[model samples]
Target: MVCTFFENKVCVETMEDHIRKGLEIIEGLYLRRGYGHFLSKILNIDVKLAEELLKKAYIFHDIGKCLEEFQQRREKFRFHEVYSALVAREVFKKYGDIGGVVSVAILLHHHNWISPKRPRNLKLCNECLSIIKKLSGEKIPEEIPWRNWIEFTEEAEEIMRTNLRGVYSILLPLVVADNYAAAVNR
Candidate 1:
Protein backbone atom coordinates (compact mmCIF):
# COMPACT_ATOMS: atom_id res chain seq x y z
CA MET A 1 0.00 0.00 0.00
CA VAL A 2 1.02 3.66 -0.55
CA CYS A 3 0.18 6.65 1.61
CA THR A 4 0.41 10.36 1.03
CA PHE A 5 -0.19 13.63 2.83
CA PHE A 6 -3.86 14.41 2.36
CA GLU A 7 -5.43 17.39 4.10
CA ASN A 8 -4.72 17.14 7.83
CA LYS A 9 -4.02 13.43 8.02
CA VAL A 10 -2.20 10.64 6.23
CA CYS A 11 -4.23 9.27 3.35
CA VAL A 12 -3.27 5.92 1.86
CA GLU A 13 -3.30 4.75 -1.72
CA THR A 14 -2.65 1.08 -2.31
CA MET A 15 -0.82 -0.36 -5.32
CA GLU A 16 -4.09 -1.96 -6.29
CA ASP A 17 -5.73 1.45 -6.08
CA HIS A 18 -3.16 2.95 -8.42
CA ILE A 19 -3.51 0.10 -10.93
CA ARG A 20 -7.28 0.50 -10.83
CA LYS A 21 -6.93 4.20 -11.53
CA GLY A 22 -4.59 3.52 -14.46
CA LEU A 23 -6.96 0.98 -15.97
CA GLU A 24 -9.85 3.39 -15.68
CA ILE A 25 -7.83 6.03 -17.46
CA ILE A 26 -6.69 3.77 -20.27
CA GLU A 27 -10.02 2.07 -20.76
CA GLY A 28 -12.12 5.17 -20.12
CA LEU A 29 -10.07 7.82 -21.90
CA TYR A 30 -8.05 5.90 -24.48
CA LEU A 31 -9.89 2.74 -25.42
CA ARG A 32 -13.38 4.17 -25.30
CA ARG A 33 -12.31 7.44 -26.91
CA GLY A 34 -10.34 5.73 -29.71
CA TYR A 35 -7.31 7.79 -28.73
CA GLY A 36 -5.02 5.04 -29.97
CA HIS A 37 -5.74 6.06 -33.55
CA PHE A 38 -2.72 8.34 -33.69
CA LEU A 39 -0.39 5.39 -34.29
CA SER A 40 -2.64 2.81 -35.83
CA LYS A 41 -0.66 2.79 -39.04
CA ILE A 42 2.70 2.88 -37.31
CA LEU A 43 2.34 0.24 -34.65
CA ASN A 44 1.33 -2.47 -37.16
CA ILE A 45 0.09 -4.82 -34.47
CA ASP A 46 -3.54 -5.89 -34.47
CA VAL A 47 -5.83 -3.11 -33.21
CA LYS A 48 -7.01 -5.06 -30.19
CA LEU A 49 -3.54 -6.33 -29.41
CA ALA A 50 -1.80 -2.98 -29.85
CA GLU A 51 -4.18 -1.14 -27.59
CA GLU A 52 -3.98 -3.95 -25.07
CA LEU A 53 -0.20 -3.73 -25.21
CA LEU A 54 -0.28 0.00 -24.62
CA LYS A 55 -2.38 -0.34 -21.51
CA LYS A 56 -0.33 -3.24 -20.25
CA ALA A 57 2.81 -1.19 -20.74
CA TYR A 58 1.45 1.83 -18.91
CA ILE A 59 -0.04 -0.29 -16.15
CA PHE A 60 3.30 -1.44 -14.80
CA HIS A 61 5.35 1.69 -15.43
CA ASP A 62 4.78 2.91 -11.92
CA ILE A 63 5.07 -0.46 -10.18
CA GLY A 64 7.96 1.14 -8.39
CA LYS A 65 5.46 2.99 -6.25
CA CYS A 66 4.72 -0.36 -4.65
CA LEU A 67 7.89 0.31 -2.68
CA GLU A 68 7.53 1.80 0.78
CA GLU A 69 10.58 4.06 0.81
CA PHE A 70 8.46 7.21 1.29
CA GLN A 71 10.77 9.74 -0.41
CA GLN A 72 11.35 7.35 -3.35
CA ARG A 73 7.72 7.75 -4.37
CA ARG A 74 8.42 10.81 -6.55
CA GLU A 75 12.16 10.89 -7.06
CA LYS A 76 12.47 10.93 -10.86
CA PHE A 77 15.70 8.91 -11.06
CA ARG A 78 15.06 6.33 -8.37
CA PHE A 79 15.53 2.53 -8.72
CA HIS A 80 11.91 1.42 -8.64
CA GLU A 81 11.58 1.47 -12.41
CA VAL A 82 14.28 -1.17 -12.55
CA TYR A 83 12.49 -3.42 -10.12
CA SER A 84 9.20 -2.61 -11.77
CA ALA A 85 10.56 -3.32 -15.23
CA LEU A 86 12.35 -6.52 -14.27
CA VAL A 87 9.56 -7.96 -12.16
CA ALA A 88 6.91 -7.08 -14.71
CA ARG A 89 9.03 -8.90 -17.27
CA GLU A 90 8.53 -12.03 -15.20
CA VAL A 91 4.80 -11.45 -15.27
CA PHE A 92 4.85 -10.76 -19.00
CA LYS A 93 6.95 -13.81 -19.85
CA LYS A 94 4.03 -16.19 -19.78
CA TYR A 95 1.85 -13.58 -21.48
CA GLY A 96 3.80 -12.93 -24.72
CA ASP A 97 7.14 -12.13 -26.32
CA ILE A 98 6.22 -8.54 -27.14
CA GLY A 99 5.62 -7.87 -23.48
CA GLY A 100 9.40 -8.17 -23.24
CA VAL A 101 9.53 -4.94 -25.21
CA VAL A 102 6.91 -3.54 -22.90
CA SER A 103 9.31 -4.28 -20.08
CA VAL A 104 11.92 -2.07 -21.75
CA ALA A 105 9.40 0.74 -21.89
CA ILE A 106 8.69 0.23 -18.20
CA LEU A 107 12.39 0.17 -17.36
CA LEU A 108 12.91 3.49 -19.01
CA HIS A 109 9.53 5.12 -18.41
CA HIS A 110 10.75 7.16 -15.46
CA HIS A 111 14.39 7.47 -16.52
CA ASN A 112 15.97 10.82 -17.35
CA TRP A 113 18.76 11.46 -19.87
CA ILE A 114 21.99 11.83 -17.94
CA SER A 115 25.30 10.07 -18.29
CA PRO A 116 25.60 7.02 -16.06
CA LYS A 117 27.49 7.85 -12.91
CA ARG A 118 27.64 4.50 -11.21
CA PRO A 119 30.13 6.31 -9.04
CA ARG A 120 27.30 8.55 -7.87
CA ASN A 121 24.62 5.91 -8.20
CA LEU A 122 26.94 3.31 -6.75
CA LYS A 123 24.50 2.50 -4.01
CA LEU A 124 21.45 3.26 -6.16
CA CYS A 125 22.21 0.66 -8.84
CA ASN A 126 23.62 -1.77 -6.32
CA GLU A 127 20.48 -2.09 -4.23
CA CYS A 128 18.28 -2.37 -7.30
CA LEU A 129 20.55 -5.02 -8.82
CA SER A 130 20.33 -7.19 -5.74
CA ILE A 131 16.55 -7.10 -5.76
CA ILE A 132 16.50 -7.71 -9.49
CA LYS A 133 18.75 -10.74 -9.05
CA LYS A 134 16.62 -12.14 -6.26
CA LEU A 135 13.43 -11.60 -8.22
CA SER A 136 14.51 -12.33 -11.81
CA GLY A 137 17.52 -14.53 -11.12
CA GLU A 138 19.22 -12.70 -13.97
CA LYS A 139 21.74 -9.92 -13.60
CA ILE A 140 21.18 -6.58 -15.27
CA PRO A 141 24.09 -4.66 -16.74
CA GLU A 142 26.50 -3.31 -14.15
CA GLU A 143 25.52 0.21 -15.19
CA ILE A 144 22.35 0.41 -17.18
CA PRO A 145 23.23 2.94 -19.85
CA TRP A 146 21.56 6.34 -19.59
CA ARG A 147 19.77 7.49 -22.69
CA ASN A 148 16.52 9.08 -23.74
CA TRP A 149 14.18 6.85 -21.76
CA ILE A 150 12.46 5.92 -25.00
CA GLU A 151 15.69 5.15 -26.84
CA PHE A 152 16.30 1.57 -28.02
CA THR A 153 18.93 -0.01 -30.23
CA GLU A 154 18.50 -0.53 -33.99
CA GLU A 155 18.30 -4.27 -33.62
CA ALA A 156 15.58 -3.73 -31.05
CA GLU A 157 13.97 -1.18 -33.31
CA GLU A 158 14.13 -3.67 -36.15
CA ILE A 159 12.46 -6.13 -33.85
CA MET A 160 9.96 -3.50 -32.71
CA ARG A 161 9.83 -1.78 -36.12
CA THR A 162 9.13 1.28 -34.03
CA ASN A 163 11.41 4.17 -33.22
CA LEU A 164 11.30 6.70 -30.42
CA ARG A 165 8.70 8.77 -32.28
CA GLY A 166 6.62 5.70 -33.01
CA VAL A 167 6.91 4.24 -29.52
CA TYR A 168 6.57 7.64 -27.85
CA SER A 169 3.36 8.06 -29.81
CA ILE A 170 1.90 5.32 -27.63
CA LEU A 171 3.77 6.41 -24.51
CA LEU A 172 2.46 10.00 -24.77
CA PRO A 173 -1.05 8.81 -24.08
CA LEU A 174 0.04 6.41 -21.34
CA VAL A 175 1.92 9.16 -19.52
CA VAL A 176 -0.84 11.75 -19.91
CA ALA A 177 -3.46 9.26 -18.85
CA ASP A 178 -1.41 8.21 -15.83
CA ASN A 179 -0.98 11.80 -14.69
CA TYR A 180 -4.63 12.73 -15.20
CA ALA A 181 -5.82 9.80 -13.14
CA ALA A 182 -3.41 10.67 -10.36
CA ALA A 183 -4.74 14.23 -10.32
CA VAL A 184 -8.38 13.16 -10.20
CA ASN A 185 -7.62 10.72 -7.41
CA ARG A 186 -5.55 13.36 -5.57
Candidate 2:
Protein backbone atom coordinates (compact mmCIF):
# COMPACT_ATOMS: atom_id res chain seq x y z
CA MET A 1 0.00 0.00 0.00
CA VAL A 2 3.03 2.23 0.24
CA CYS A 3 4.12 4.31 -2.72
CA THR A 4 7.54 3.48 -4.05
CA PHE A 5 8.41 7.12 -4.44
CA PHE A 6 7.99 7.35 -0.71
CA GLU A 7 10.67 4.80 -0.13
CA ASN A 8 13.14 6.46 2.26
CA LYS A 9 12.18 9.90 1.00
CA VAL A 10 11.72 13.00 3.10
CA CYS A 11 8.66 14.14 1.14
CA VAL A 12 6.98 10.84 1.90
CA GLU A 13 7.95 11.14 5.50
CA THR A 14 6.67 14.67 5.63
CA MET A 15 3.39 13.61 4.05
CA GLU A 16 2.84 10.96 6.67
CA ASP A 17 3.87 13.40 9.35
CA HIS A 18 1.41 15.97 8.09
CA ILE A 19 -1.33 13.39 8.01
CA ARG A 20 -0.63 12.77 11.66
CA LYS A 21 -0.97 16.47 12.34
CA GLY A 22 -4.20 16.62 10.34
CA LEU A 23 -5.56 13.68 12.31
CA GLU A 24 -4.96 15.63 15.45
CA ILE A 25 -7.01 18.48 14.04
CA ILE A 26 -9.83 16.13 13.21
CA GLU A 27 -9.63 14.55 16.64
CA GLY A 28 -9.94 17.91 18.31
CA LEU A 29 -13.04 18.47 16.26
CA TYR A 30 -14.45 15.12 17.36
CA LEU A 31 -13.64 15.67 21.02
CA ARG A 32 -15.41 19.02 21.06
CA ARG A 33 -18.61 17.13 20.31
CA GLY A 34 -18.07 14.60 23.15
CA TYR A 35 -16.59 11.15 22.92
CA GLY A 36 -18.54 8.94 20.52
CA HIS A 37 -21.73 10.86 21.27
CA PHE A 38 -20.99 13.78 18.98
CA LEU A 39 -19.95 11.62 16.08
CA SER A 40 -23.06 9.48 16.41
CA LYS A 41 -25.26 12.53 16.59
CA ILE A 42 -23.60 14.61 13.89
CA LEU A 43 -23.17 11.82 11.39
CA ASN A 44 -26.57 10.27 12.22
CA ILE A 45 -24.84 7.05 11.51
CA ASP A 46 -23.92 4.15 13.73
CA VAL A 47 -20.59 4.35 15.50
CA LYS A 48 -19.03 1.92 13.06
CA LEU A 49 -20.20 3.75 9.96
CA ALA A 50 -19.30 7.14 11.33
CA GLU A 51 -15.92 5.88 12.33
CA GLU A 52 -15.40 4.34 8.94
CA LEU A 53 -16.31 7.48 7.03
CA LEU A 54 -14.16 9.71 9.20
CA LYS A 55 -11.21 7.41 8.77
CA LYS A 56 -11.59 7.37 5.00
CA ALA A 57 -12.12 11.11 5.02
CA TYR A 58 -8.90 11.70 6.89
CA ILE A 59 -6.68 9.26 4.99
CA PHE A 60 -7.57 9.82 1.36
CA HIS A 61 -8.23 13.45 2.13
CA ASP A 62 -4.63 14.04 1.13
CA ILE A 63 -3.86 11.18 -1.22
CA GLY A 64 -3.32 13.63 -4.01
CA LYS A 65 -0.40 15.04 -2.06
CA CYS A 66 1.54 12.07 -3.28
CA LEU A 67 1.63 13.45 -6.76
CA GLU A 68 4.74 15.40 -7.68
CA GLU A 69 2.65 18.11 -9.33
CA PHE A 70 0.56 18.38 -6.21
CA GLN A 71 3.63 18.56 -4.02
CA GLN A 72 5.19 21.31 -6.09
CA ARG A 73 1.94 23.23 -6.31
CA ARG A 74 1.36 22.94 -2.56
CA GLU A 75 4.64 24.73 -2.07
CA LYS A 76 3.22 27.84 -3.73
CA PHE A 77 -0.54 27.30 -3.99
CA ARG A 78 -3.74 26.33 -2.21
CA PHE A 79 -4.73 23.55 -4.58
CA HIS A 80 -4.37 20.67 -2.13
CA GLU A 81 -8.11 20.11 -1.93
CA VAL A 82 -8.47 19.99 -5.69
CA TYR A 83 -5.58 17.58 -6.01
CA SER A 84 -6.94 15.41 -3.21
CA ALA A 85 -10.29 15.15 -4.95
CA LEU A 86 -8.64 14.15 -8.19
CA VAL A 87 -6.60 11.57 -6.36
CA ALA A 88 -9.72 10.24 -4.67
CA ARG A 89 -11.38 9.70 -8.04
CA GLU A 90 -8.31 8.08 -9.47
CA VAL A 91 -7.98 5.79 -6.47
CA PHE A 92 -11.65 4.95 -6.01
CA LYS A 93 -12.29 3.69 -9.55
CA LYS A 94 -10.75 0.34 -8.74
CA TYR A 95 -13.09 -0.64 -5.95
CA GLY A 96 -16.73 -1.61 -6.51
CA ASP A 97 -19.22 -0.36 -3.87
CA ILE A 98 -16.96 1.24 -1.23
CA GLY A 99 -15.00 3.13 -3.85
CA GLY A 100 -17.94 5.45 -4.40
CA VAL A 101 -18.12 6.44 -0.76
CA VAL A 102 -14.39 7.02 -0.40
CA SER A 103 -14.27 9.03 -3.60
CA VAL A 104 -17.12 11.30 -2.54
CA ALA A 105 -15.75 11.91 0.93
CA ILE A 106 -12.25 12.75 -0.24
CA LEU A 107 -13.37 14.99 -3.11
CA LEU A 108 -15.57 17.34 -1.17
CA HIS A 109 -14.18 17.27 2.36
CA HIS A 110 -12.98 20.83 1.97
CA HIS A 111 -15.39 22.17 -0.63
CA ASN A 112 -16.99 25.52 0.00
CA TRP A 113 -20.32 24.58 -1.52
CA ILE A 114 -21.90 21.55 -3.05
CA SER A 115 -23.55 22.50 -6.29
CA PRO A 116 -27.24 21.71 -6.72
CA LYS A 117 -26.22 20.08 -9.95
CA ARG A 118 -23.09 18.00 -9.58
CA PRO A 119 -20.32 18.34 -12.11
CA ARG A 120 -19.98 15.42 -14.47
CA ASN A 121 -16.28 15.29 -13.76
CA LEU A 122 -16.91 15.07 -10.02
CA LYS A 123 -18.78 11.81 -10.06
CA LEU A 124 -19.33 11.67 -6.30
CA CYS A 125 -19.69 15.35 -5.48
CA ASN A 126 -23.43 14.97 -4.99
CA GLU A 127 -23.03 12.19 -2.49
CA CYS A 128 -20.35 14.11 -0.63
CA LEU A 129 -22.77 17.01 -0.48
CA SER A 130 -25.34 14.81 1.13
CA ILE A 131 -22.89 13.62 3.71
CA ILE A 132 -21.73 17.14 4.45
CA LYS A 133 -25.25 18.46 4.89
CA LYS A 134 -26.13 15.63 7.19
CA LEU A 135 -23.07 15.86 9.39
CA SER A 136 -21.89 19.47 9.31
CA GLY A 137 -23.52 22.23 11.32
CA GLU A 138 -21.76 25.19 9.75
CA LYS A 139 -22.23 26.47 6.23
CA ILE A 140 -19.39 25.95 3.80
CA PRO A 141 -17.04 28.90 3.91
CA GLU A 142 -17.74 31.42 1.15
CA GLU A 143 -14.42 33.17 1.07
CA ILE A 144 -11.54 30.81 0.68
CA PRO A 145 -8.18 31.94 -0.59
CA TRP A 146 -7.75 30.75 -4.13
CA ARG A 147 -4.65 28.76 -4.96
CA ASN A 148 -3.24 28.12 -8.37
CA TRP A 149 -4.03 24.72 -9.76
CA ILE A 150 -1.38 22.57 -11.38
CA GLU A 151 -1.68 20.45 -14.47
CA PHE A 152 0.15 17.15 -14.43
CA THR A 153 2.82 16.50 -17.01
CA GLU A 154 2.08 13.79 -19.56
CA GLU A 155 4.33 11.22 -17.89
CA ALA A 156 2.90 11.85 -14.40
CA GLU A 157 -0.62 11.76 -15.79
CA GLU A 158 0.02 8.41 -17.39
CA ILE A 159 1.47 6.99 -14.19
CA MET A 160 -1.49 8.20 -12.18
CA ARG A 161 -3.86 6.76 -14.75
CA THR A 162 -2.30 3.35 -14.53
CA ASN A 163 -1.67 3.06 -10.76
CA LEU A 164 -4.17 5.23 -8.92
CA ARG A 165 -7.06 2.83 -9.37
CA GLY A 166 -5.40 0.07 -7.39
CA VAL A 167 -5.02 2.17 -4.24
CA TYR A 168 -8.81 2.65 -3.92
CA SER A 169 -9.65 -0.86 -2.79
CA ILE A 170 -6.82 -1.29 -0.34
CA LEU A 171 -6.24 2.11 1.19
CA LEU A 172 -9.75 3.55 1.37
CA PRO A 173 -10.85 1.83 4.57
CA LEU A 174 -7.45 1.98 6.19
CA VAL A 175 -7.45 5.68 5.59
CA VAL A 176 -10.87 5.89 7.17
CA ALA A 177 -9.89 3.83 10.17
CA ASP A 178 -6.68 5.70 10.75
CA ASN A 179 -8.41 9.05 10.83
CA TYR A 180 -11.21 7.78 13.01
CA ALA A 181 -8.75 6.46 15.54
CA ALA A 182 -6.75 9.63 15.42
CA ALA A 183 -9.87 11.65 16.04
CA VAL A 184 -10.75 9.51 19.01
CA ASN A 185 -7.28 9.78 20.41
CA ARG A 186 -7.29 13.53 20.15
Candidate 3:
Protein backbone atom coordinates (compact mmCIF):
# COMPACT_ATOMS: atom_id res chain seq x y z
CA MET A 1 0.00 0.00 0.00
CA VAL A 2 1.08 3.57 -0.63
CA CYS A 3 0.95 6.49 1.76
CA THR A 4 -1.59 8.89 0.44
CA PHE A 5 -3.64 11.99 1.16
CA PHE A 6 -7.20 12.70 0.11
CA GLU A 7 -6.29 16.11 -1.26
CA ASN A 8 -9.77 16.59 -2.64
CA LYS A 9 -12.98 14.62 -3.05
CA VAL A 10 -11.77 12.63 -6.06
CA CYS A 11 -8.03 13.12 -5.73
CA VAL A 12 -5.62 11.05 -3.65
CA GLU A 13 -1.88 11.41 -3.75
CA THR A 14 1.10 10.90 -1.51
CA MET A 15 3.19 13.80 -0.32
CA GLU A 16 6.13 12.11 -1.99
CA ASP A 17 4.28 11.73 -5.28
CA HIS A 18 2.78 15.20 -5.44
CA ILE A 19 5.87 17.06 -4.34
CA ARG A 20 7.96 15.13 -6.84
CA LYS A 21 5.74 16.47 -9.58
CA GLY A 22 5.94 19.90 -8.00
CA LEU A 23 9.74 19.74 -8.02
CA GLU A 24 9.73 19.05 -11.74
CA ILE A 25 7.71 22.21 -12.28
CA ILE A 26 9.94 24.21 -9.98
CA GLU A 27 12.99 23.07 -11.87
CA GLY A 28 11.79 23.13 -15.45
CA LEU A 29 9.03 25.70 -15.89
CA TYR A 30 10.25 27.99 -13.13
CA LEU A 31 14.01 27.72 -12.74
CA ARG A 32 15.24 26.51 -16.09
CA ARG A 33 13.16 29.10 -17.87
CA GLY A 34 13.87 32.84 -17.86
CA TYR A 35 11.95 33.09 -14.56
CA GLY A 36 15.07 32.14 -12.64
CA HIS A 37 17.00 35.07 -14.13
CA PHE A 38 14.21 37.43 -13.19
CA LEU A 39 14.24 36.01 -9.70
CA SER A 40 17.97 36.50 -9.45
CA LYS A 41 17.54 40.14 -10.34
CA ILE A 42 14.70 40.49 -7.84
CA LEU A 43 16.74 38.91 -5.06
CA ASN A 44 19.99 40.61 -6.06
CA ILE A 45 21.87 37.35 -6.30
CA ASP A 46 23.52 35.29 -8.96
CA VAL A 47 21.38 32.75 -10.80
CA LYS A 48 23.31 29.91 -9.20
CA LEU A 49 22.50 30.96 -5.63
CA ALA A 50 18.93 31.84 -6.52
CA GLU A 51 18.40 28.45 -8.12
CA GLU A 52 19.93 26.63 -5.13
CA LEU A 53 17.78 28.44 -2.59
CA LEU A 54 14.65 28.05 -4.67
CA LYS A 55 15.19 24.33 -5.14
CA LYS A 56 15.75 23.85 -1.42
CA ALA A 57 12.82 26.09 -0.57
CA TYR A 58 10.45 24.26 -2.90
CA ILE A 59 11.59 20.80 -1.79
CA PHE A 60 11.15 21.32 1.95
CA HIS A 61 8.24 23.71 1.87
CA ASP A 62 5.48 21.12 2.27
CA ILE A 63 7.14 18.70 4.66
CA GLY A 64 4.82 19.56 7.50
CA LYS A 65 2.31 17.43 5.63
CA CYS A 66 4.44 14.53 6.87
CA LEU A 67 2.80 14.90 10.26
CA GLU A 68 0.64 11.99 11.33
CA GLU A 69 -2.33 14.23 11.81
CA PHE A 70 -2.18 15.23 8.20
CA GLN A 71 -1.48 11.72 6.98
CA GLN A 72 -4.52 10.20 8.60
CA ARG A 73 -6.66 13.33 8.81
CA ARG A 74 -9.00 12.09 11.52
CA GLU A 75 -9.39 15.73 12.39
CA LYS A 76 -8.62 18.90 10.55
CA PHE A 77 -5.03 19.06 9.45
CA ARG A 78 -4.02 22.64 10.24
CA PHE A 79 -0.92 24.74 10.68
CA HIS A 80 1.28 22.28 8.85
CA GLU A 81 3.23 25.09 7.18
CA VAL A 82 4.44 26.37 10.55
CA TYR A 83 5.86 22.96 11.32
CA SER A 84 7.36 22.96 7.85
CA ALA A 85 9.19 26.18 8.66
CA LEU A 86 10.67 24.64 11.79
CA VAL A 87 11.87 21.61 9.86
CA ALA A 88 13.17 23.75 6.99
CA ARG A 89 15.11 25.94 9.42
CA GLU A 90 16.94 22.86 10.65
CA VAL A 91 17.51 21.56 7.13
CA PHE A 92 19.13 24.85 6.01
CA LYS A 93 20.49 26.16 9.31
CA LYS A 94 24.02 25.54 8.06
CA TYR A 95 23.43 28.00 5.24
CA GLY A 96 23.53 30.95 7.71
CA ASP A 97 21.15 33.89 7.14
CA ILE A 98 19.84 32.24 4.02
CA GLY A 99 18.47 29.57 6.33
CA GLY A 100 16.18 32.09 7.93
CA VAL A 101 15.20 33.43 4.53
CA VAL A 102 14.44 29.97 3.17
CA SER A 103 12.64 28.89 6.29
CA VAL A 104 10.53 32.04 6.16
CA ALA A 105 9.68 31.28 2.56
CA ILE A 106 8.28 27.89 3.57
CA LEU A 107 6.53 29.35 6.61
CA LEU A 108 4.59 31.79 4.50
CA HIS A 109 4.24 29.53 1.47
CA HIS A 110 0.50 29.35 1.92
CA HIS A 111 0.19 33.06 2.65
CA ASN A 112 -0.61 33.29 6.38
CA TRP A 113 -1.01 31.09 9.45
CA ILE A 114 -4.64 31.73 10.21
CA SER A 115 -5.39 29.17 12.90
CA PRO A 116 -5.77 30.66 16.37
CA LYS A 117 -4.95 27.40 18.17
CA ARG A 118 -1.43 26.06 18.40
CA PRO A 119 -0.60 22.56 17.13
CA ARG A 120 0.57 19.97 19.61
CA ASN A 121 2.81 16.87 19.47
CA LEU A 122 4.19 17.81 16.10
CA LYS A 123 5.93 14.71 14.73
CA LEU A 124 6.94 13.48 11.28
CA CYS A 125 6.67 9.81 10.51
CA ASN A 126 9.80 7.95 9.42
CA GLU A 127 8.04 6.87 6.27
CA CYS A 128 7.43 10.50 5.50
CA LEU A 129 11.09 11.34 6.06
CA SER A 130 11.96 8.68 3.53
CA ILE A 131 9.64 10.39 1.10
CA ILE A 132 11.37 13.68 1.82
CA LYS A 133 14.76 12.04 1.38
CA LYS A 134 13.79 10.72 -2.01
CA LEU A 135 12.55 14.09 -3.21
CA SER A 136 15.36 16.06 -1.53
CA GLY A 137 18.11 13.68 -2.73
CA GLU A 138 19.68 13.83 0.73
CA LYS A 139 19.27 12.53 4.22
CA ILE A 140 16.69 14.23 6.41
CA PRO A 141 16.89 14.19 10.18
CA GLU A 142 14.53 11.67 11.72
CA GLU A 143 13.62 13.94 14.55
CA ILE A 144 11.17 16.74 13.92
CA PRO A 145 12.47 20.17 14.85
CA TRP A 146 10.13 20.86 17.72
CA ARG A 147 9.84 24.57 18.41
CA ASN A 148 7.37 27.37 19.03
CA TRP A 149 5.99 28.46 15.68
CA ILE A 150 4.92 31.88 17.00
CA GLU A 151 8.42 32.85 18.08
CA PHE A 152 9.87 31.44 14.86
CA THR A 153 7.29 33.42 12.90
CA GLU A 154 8.48 36.60 14.56
CA GLU A 155 12.11 35.79 13.77
CA ALA A 156 11.29 34.91 10.17
CA GLU A 157 9.33 38.14 9.75
CA GLU A 158 12.33 40.12 10.98
CA ILE A 159 14.49 38.38 8.39
CA MET A 160 11.98 39.15 5.66
CA ARG A 161 11.95 42.82 6.65
CA THR A 162 15.69 43.26 7.03
CA ASN A 163 17.78 40.60 5.35
CA LEU A 164 15.35 40.09 2.48
CA ARG A 165 14.53 43.81 2.23
CA GLY A 166 10.79 43.08 2.15
CA VAL A 167 10.91 41.19 -1.15
CA TYR A 168 8.84 38.10 -2.00
CA SER A 169 11.74 36.84 -4.05
CA ILE A 170 11.50 33.22 -2.87
CA LEU A 171 7.86 33.20 -1.85
CA LEU A 172 6.22 34.42 -5.03
CA PRO A 173 7.54 31.52 -7.06
CA LEU A 174 6.84 28.98 -4.34
CA VAL A 175 3.18 29.93 -4.16
CA VAL A 176 2.79 30.06 -7.91
CA ALA A 177 4.51 26.75 -8.44
CA ASP A 178 2.68 25.06 -5.59
CA ASN A 179 -0.74 26.04 -6.89
CA TYR A 180 0.16 25.15 -10.44
CA ALA A 181 1.49 21.77 -9.40
CA ALA A 182 -1.59 20.94 -7.40
CA ALA A 183 -3.93 21.91 -10.17
CA VAL A 184 -2.07 20.01 -12.86
CA ASN A 185 -2.98 16.31 -13.11
CA ARG A 186 0.55 15.29 -14.08
lDDT leader: 3
Candidate 3 lDDT over 1-186, as tens digits, reads 123345453335556666767778788878778766876676666778778778878878887777766666533346767778888888888766766777887877765524434556456777777766766676666556766557776787688778674236777778877776677643
Locate the minimum summed-lDDT window of 10 residues in model 1: 115-124
Count of clashes in candidate 2: 4
**TM-score winner between candidates 1 and 2:** 1
- lDDT values, one for every candidate: 0.53, 0.42, 0.70
Per residue, candidate 2 scores C-alpha lDDT tens digits across 1-186 of 112123333233344444555556455655335534544563344566555445445655654444434333334213445656555454444543345445444544445754222222322233233333343322221112112223223323444455444334333434554455445433
Candidate achieving higher lDDT, 2 or 3: 3
- Weakest lDDT window of 10 consecutive positions for candidate 2: 140-149
Lowest lDDT 10-mer window, candidate 3? 1-10
- Candidate 1 TM-score, C-alpha based: 0.57
Best by TM-score: 3
- Pairs of colliding residues, candidate 3: none
Task: TM-score each candidate.
Answer: 0.57, 0.39, 0.80
1-186: candidate 1 lDDT, tens digit per residue:
243223334454434455567677777877888756644556555677677667666655664444434324333325666656654565555545555666666655666753222222322234434433443344444432333334333433454455555556556666776666667667
**How many backbone clashes can be found in candidate 3?**
0
